[PDB]
Amino acid sequence: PTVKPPTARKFIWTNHKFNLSGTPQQYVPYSTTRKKIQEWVPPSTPYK
Amino acid sequence: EMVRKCDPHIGLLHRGTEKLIEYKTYLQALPYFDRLDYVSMMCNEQAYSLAVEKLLNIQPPPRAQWIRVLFGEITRLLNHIMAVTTHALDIGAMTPFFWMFEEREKMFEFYERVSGARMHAAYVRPGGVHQDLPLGLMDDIYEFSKNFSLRIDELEEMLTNNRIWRNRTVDIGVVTAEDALNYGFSGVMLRGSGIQWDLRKTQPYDVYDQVEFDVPIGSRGDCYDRYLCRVEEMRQSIRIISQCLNKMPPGEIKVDDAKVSPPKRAEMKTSMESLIHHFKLYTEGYQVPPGATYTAIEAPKGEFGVYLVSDGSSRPYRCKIKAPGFAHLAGLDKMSKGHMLADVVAIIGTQDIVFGEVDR
Amino acid sequence: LHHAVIPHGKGGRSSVSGIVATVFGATGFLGRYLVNHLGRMGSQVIVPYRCEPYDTMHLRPMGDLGQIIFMDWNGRDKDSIRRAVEHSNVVINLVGREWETKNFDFEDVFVKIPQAIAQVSKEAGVEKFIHISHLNADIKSSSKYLRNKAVGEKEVRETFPEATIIKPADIFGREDRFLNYFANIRWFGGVPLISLGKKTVKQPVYIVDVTKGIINAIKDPDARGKTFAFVGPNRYLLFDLVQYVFAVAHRPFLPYPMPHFAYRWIGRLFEISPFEPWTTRDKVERIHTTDRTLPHLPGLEDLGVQATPLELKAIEVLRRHRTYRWLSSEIEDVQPAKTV
Amino acid sequence: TRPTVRPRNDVAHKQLSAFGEYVAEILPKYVQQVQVSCFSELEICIHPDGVIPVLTFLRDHSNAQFKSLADLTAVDIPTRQNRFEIVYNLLSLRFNSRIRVKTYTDELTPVESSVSVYKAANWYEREIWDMFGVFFANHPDLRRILTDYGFEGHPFRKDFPLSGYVELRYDDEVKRVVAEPVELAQEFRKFDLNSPWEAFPAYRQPPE
Amino acid sequence: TSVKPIFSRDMNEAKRRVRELYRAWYREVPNTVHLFQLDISVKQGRDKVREMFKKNAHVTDPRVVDLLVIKGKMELEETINVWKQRTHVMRFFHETEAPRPKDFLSKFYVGHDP
Amino acid sequence: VKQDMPPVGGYGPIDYKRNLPRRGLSGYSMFAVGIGALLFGYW
Amino acid sequence: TQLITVDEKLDITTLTGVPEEHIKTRKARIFVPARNNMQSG
Amino acid sequence: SRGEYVVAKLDDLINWARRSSLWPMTFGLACCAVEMMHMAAPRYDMDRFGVVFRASPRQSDVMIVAGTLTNKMAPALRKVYDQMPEPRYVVSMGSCANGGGYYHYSYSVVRGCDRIVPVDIYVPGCPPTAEALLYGILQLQKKIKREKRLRIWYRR
Amino acid sequence: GSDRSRFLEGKRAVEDKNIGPLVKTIMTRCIQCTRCIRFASEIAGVDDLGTTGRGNDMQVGTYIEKMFMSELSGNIIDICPVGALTSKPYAFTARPWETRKTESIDVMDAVGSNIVVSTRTGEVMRILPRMHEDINEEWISDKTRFAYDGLKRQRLTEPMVRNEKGLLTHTTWEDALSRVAGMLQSCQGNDVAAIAGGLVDAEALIALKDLLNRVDSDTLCTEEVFPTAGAGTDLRSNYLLNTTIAGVEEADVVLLVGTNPRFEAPLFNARIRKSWLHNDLKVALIGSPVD
Amino acid sequence: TYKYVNLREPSMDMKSVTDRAAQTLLWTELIRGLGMTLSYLFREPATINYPFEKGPLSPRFRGEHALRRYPSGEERCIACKLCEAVCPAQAITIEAEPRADGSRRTTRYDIDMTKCIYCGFCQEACPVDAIVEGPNFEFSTETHEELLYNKEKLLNNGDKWEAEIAANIQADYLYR
Amino acid sequence: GVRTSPTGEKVTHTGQVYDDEDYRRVRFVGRQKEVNENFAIDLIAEQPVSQVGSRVISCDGGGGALGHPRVYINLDKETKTGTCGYCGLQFRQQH
Ligand SMILES: CCCCCCCCCCCCCCCCCC(=O)OC[C@H](COP(=O)(O)OCCN)OC(=O)CCCCCCCCCCCCCCCCC
């Protein structure tokens, strides 16, 4: 890369990180979607 | 310690390949054939591709055929190296294993250069091959083929004349010709028992009828003659590799029928027909006409066959895999009659058995 | 009620049981069985561990992916407990130790830590809190074990009015310290007892039945505020109990009496070891203490758990203590113990 | 049709048709159909009662000499009343040829074992019994060969699901590898990939 | 409706085969609990054998009961030698599996399955 | 077009036959050496 | 002869190995699949 | 004071002696075994790091699960793992031993070896390269280095 | 078709039009098959789609900012051979090869349209018509096609009972069921009654009828009013469409009294329109002059 | 077309018989094997000093998965679901919906790395070169759930390794 | 342009975040939530609109075969810009 540097864009990381497994900065998976079924919130009024 | 009965219980590696094959398309079932014989992968790819091409009534271009035969010979070199060296390691001589595994690493480097994966390339496909060879690959193949004769020479010098090696192989596992035919033995067992049979000479495939080579023939059917036949097959594989390097044709590497092989990325992003075919080939897959066929090739372990039944849809109705290890392990009970523990491990070694292709 | 806590599936490994449990001291003896029974119905299990993760390795394969969450905690750090129980809905307290060490005495592991856990579970809004006491917990008991257990049980009850307190008698199992103690005492001689061990009565309970009772007490809405007493189906004197243990192990059984003051000095000698002591005076006093009867408290039969007797599991516990000669002896070729 | 169309072998087609006529007129008791495919492959579909004489004739006749049993399979077609189809593949080294022999059976009709001709048929039809439930009578050692030791059922039957009815996991209460009813974390997503347009008019079945 | 038999022409010979197989299994249960070092009593194993035999008591077709006799003899030969493990023998005892709902109310409480 | 190709004259020669050196002396030389050592040691 | 008069109902439920909960609580549906209305094929 | 210093030094000593003397057992099942013995080839040569095969489970330290774990293999794997003396470590190789891989939906394949044995390091790939397996072995060594067993004993 | 392209010039581009919040329109993909115009002119009967222009520049559209709003505006999505007219709520959600198709019955109206619910991993994705020549030949009303997103909203998921304040709070099945049973055991005769909704199956109706009959209560009511004078609900002749849904194909004189079949039973109105177009049906209405 | 391996009859001459007797008594071929091993002792060993040296690789290498972007910030994937339909192991799960500006993008894109067979069909079925199989192979984890990548992890991998994947695609794309 | 919920947990570009009463937040305790902060919508919104002088335009994403399939965009509307369906670039006729 001293002779032929790679093309640089605005989103490439400016700080490389090694394998973070076993550290507090490790990756934890999760669902990336919102709720699927909306639920009928009951009213907050007396029924009489 | 004299063996009275052997019952090899198998199925510990039974993954049930030939049901998941029925549940997937042809391109999705293509990587399943790499993992049957994980040391003769590209020959399995060639067998599956030949069966599907026979069912589809299409043929690969000549350059794809020459690449297929050259890389099949490379895979035969890899398999014979592992077979001889693991047999020697079972007997007790472990130096040739470390001696020739450097060459095995070099052929793995060739596999990764041509395909991007060290073992399971998924490179040979119905219709030809997936990608053309990178520039400068054949010169490195030429250097490796130049030195591999000396490598085989030093392995043979350390093995073929040693009296300790001879005593473990001269009269171990003797199979007659008639029982070799009757038990379904194929390949090196037949050729070491004196049967002049080879599928590359008798029922030829892609361009094996244009290259010339010799076939080693044993005389006593023992482990020694089979080991010598494997060494001579390695040398003849080097001969075929040089012949294929000298006679490589120019041109394309996929079949030009765009309804079977996917078009290039240059035209997929330009032409409407190419994009439509790319979509319907990577989502549904090509429709193979109905019919049942049985295509068998000469893998390094022997006759490797695929029995394919297609119902006209985009997915196979039935796929059966015949591997020579099944018949060889069936005959292991007869081959070990009147022997010992070291003799039975020698008989196990002289049968090149990978249990992925046996247990399926 | 939340949408992600509604139960789903058929109660298998990958199902959702709607139970978010924080089990304290899960790397011990009851914790293995409790985490195993919780993970097989598909429950979110939180394990706070003080020891090495290598000791939590055996707990790792007990449940599905992402269902067991391991994290560090300290007994004298309420903030770690607040971190552990802030998302749970059931808290189970199994913290205990058979001896007092240089850092923790009996008061710390039996009074301070349960009170802190119950207080921070009440402050975090946990509906269900379960504390595991001892059956013979007495304020006037001889040994510090039962005194501290009674004081801690009272503190937990006074600080968590909806806490369920479970009082087992004595647990026998594969990795126990009750039948294994008797089967390992044979190394040192001829199994000394106090007054030949025919003045004390024991009713041990199987570990799996205790785990089933704990799970049913988690599920049962009417167990909130109860104080159960988990005891076995049969009562044995100590002498013929040890006799049955040695008859199962097919070991020579030559008991001899020992005075009470002489046994305490023996327990003093064993408990100076910097490692885990083989025995101590507290273990001596608890071994020779009669298990009290509390008919006014509900037992395992009120939670739908059928008590399994010692005769069907003693061989499973004590088969590893036999020699090669008696390794393959069957179930029935041992005369069963005599009850009262 | 030169570069991308596979050339055909008419000489092999004619020779295999001649041999099919030869075989079907030598043994009229068992042979039901003889068919040569477009890639020159012979199929002799016979009655299941004539498994042993047809194979004996193909192994021992001077003009057949099909000395090798290359591969022996079984195919399940549930819409037939004889849902199992047993397929024998034979290789003749003297005349350098391959022939296929197909027969049919259902779940309860036994098939005569062919270990008296080829000895690889022992393990082959042992595997067929394991994977399909086809019982082979007069068999020396008929057991399971690929499935689990306590396995119930035959996996390659088309009514058997892709994932089995049980799965194995290690339980610490009994300290044992126990089998439980299956619960996939992610279900096998079934894909419907059949096009609703006809591809090959040559294979068009006539209407009702 | 005339079909090929398997071993027995009629139901009496199939019942004879069933009786002989059950005699051999009843002989085998003590050796099974001895060699494999199970923690169950011999009576429990014999009740398990009786229950597994009673699970197929409603079938009257000779060919299918011949096939079940063949499978039972296969499992007996599998257990005579040590080809099963301890886990394969105790897989007949579903101890790890939780008890399922039986009445209508518990099935209605636990889920939508019938 | 640009592709991987063999050269115009093809690649060079590649060996594929056995080449064992068959070294050592004759048997008579070895026996003479052994007898000479034996007699020298005896004297 | 070697043929047996068999008159009972054909069943292979005890040979398939499927458990009873998937054999008496299930319900098979036999149907000709409807045409996908997005297409004319 | 001094006791914490002494137990920290003893922990460092035993961690170095355990992490520099890993003896894996000869155990492979499938493609990934061929890749493991390609890691043992002279190109990479794990014998440099003190890693040498020992066939018996009694004399091994780390078990490398390389291949597909079928239903017929799971009791044998569990038994062999149980006969390995403490301390013992498990390294998972390939997608078959990780989560079933290609054969996840197979009727006779255990979906991941973590259902049977406690796994320390998961090495992904199909097959993972010899450099990848060497990276996993070095990761296991670094994990062993971070053990505080005598520190935990002194603090408890 | 063939396998590759000989075209080398620039492709055309058509300006996209807006026809409503139900149909997404991308007219670069239209091939001018003129199924839009035929469907809107013969079956929908709106006459709002046309072909403006000439030659290669011919565009199918409305020529102005007009919204094609009829009760059968999803069938143009159904009968478009290309992706020019797609479904706006369904846009970019799933793919056809993965949706599981389950045949079901529409309950939005009283026509009884046979439909296919295509789902994806236990989640309803879209509703398509089914071929049934006797009811809904291959069409459905757009309420049937687009009620699913409200079917997945505002759902009742847990049993709720009144607390000590008077608010509905979540509870278990056992507590609520016991409270309902305890109230039911204290009433007998005409102290308990039931009302049926509009989307109720016959199974629930017969179960509630039997349960209320075990307590001797025959007062079971439906929301819709039907006159019970005379025979009433005894004979099936006086409350049924006694001919057929498809019986209007053969009739030649019809008479509608006090109904708007365009918004009550839209497929019945479509069949009436088809009989009017082909067999020259004579139609007369008694009621308000609706369209 | 064939050769007779191991059909060499011996020679009965007395000089060669004495030579064979000398070989038998004095172990000629055993010293030959010793000499071959001794000559193999004095070679350069082929051990590369890992981790300070790496084995050779090709620009077509198939390693860790990543999601690329256009050279303006916009992500390249358009939720066409070709990768999840061509995946032989069913390791890809995609859920999609139109985002706030009406662009066809994903909301869920999961690759199960423990199911993936690393065959590279997704990187060749992508019509926009969005999903790629980068050159990273040293990414072993200590937990099973760390090998279950969601869209954020794949986008982070793409931003981490874009400087290399762009050059590898630039070097290789004329063969595809 | 990441946004943080009141519970302290960040929100991804998909809008996913965990509620306060959700028990699934315990997977982030002692660890961190992996969220990509380079939101593509903001970065594509900052691209300048290209002014061209034809009724129709062609887009390929830049780079030819390294981009998306070449699409054609109509610019007959004087109210809105013509956005490419793949890369999201918007073009506009200068009349
Ligand atoms: C009261 C006062 C006394 C208190 C008790 C403690 C007494 C001393 C105990 C032994 C020494 C403890 C310290 C051990 C090493 C600590 C530092 C360390 O871990 O260094 C790491 C370094 C290797 O680094 P690494 O991560 O492996 O790098 C990979 C290669 N690039 O490692 C190295 O570079 C080499 C490390 C060598 C370790 C020391 C030498 C071996 C042990 C000798 C003494 C014990 C054995 C005596 C003989 C027993 C019988 C044979």
Ligand SMILES: NC(=O)C1=CN([C@@H]2O[C@H](COP(=O)(O)OP(=O)(O)OC[C@H]3O[C@@H](n4cnc5c(N)ncnc54)[C@H](OP(=O)(O)O)[C@@H]3O)[C@@H](O)[C@H]2O)C=CC1
């Ligand atoms: N004999 C019996 O089995 C009976 C026991 N009980 C009660 O049941 C409970 C569980 O007993 P059991 O599992 O058999 O015993 P164990 O000693 O086997 O387990 C106790 C657990 O508590 C943990 N622990 C101990 N001290 C501390 C501390 N200071 N801080 C944090 N964690 C600590 C231990 O973890 P670590 O390994 O890290 O130290 C371990 O996981 C105890 O409260 C006991 O009194 C009641 C009746 C009978």
Ligand code: SF4
């Ligand atoms: S993970 Fe891949 S390479 Fe390894 S055993 Fe499985 S199929 Fe073979």
Ligand code: SF4
């Ligand atoms: S149905 Fe589709 S293709 Fe036909 S005119 Fe309408 S928009 Fe064009």
Ligand code: SF4
């Ligand atoms: S899927 Fe059909 S309508 Fe859509 S762009 Fe392709 S050819 Fe045109």
Ligand code: SF4
């Ligand atoms: S590399 Fe192959 S197996 Fe892996 S995600 Fe891509 S298509 Fe699926």
Ligand code: SF4
């Ligand atoms: S093939 Fe490419 S564009 Fe299509 S869904 Fe997959 S990653 Fe996205």
Ligand SMILES: [K+]
């Ligand atoms: K459409």
Ligand SMILES: [Zn+2]
């Ligand atoms: Zn663009």
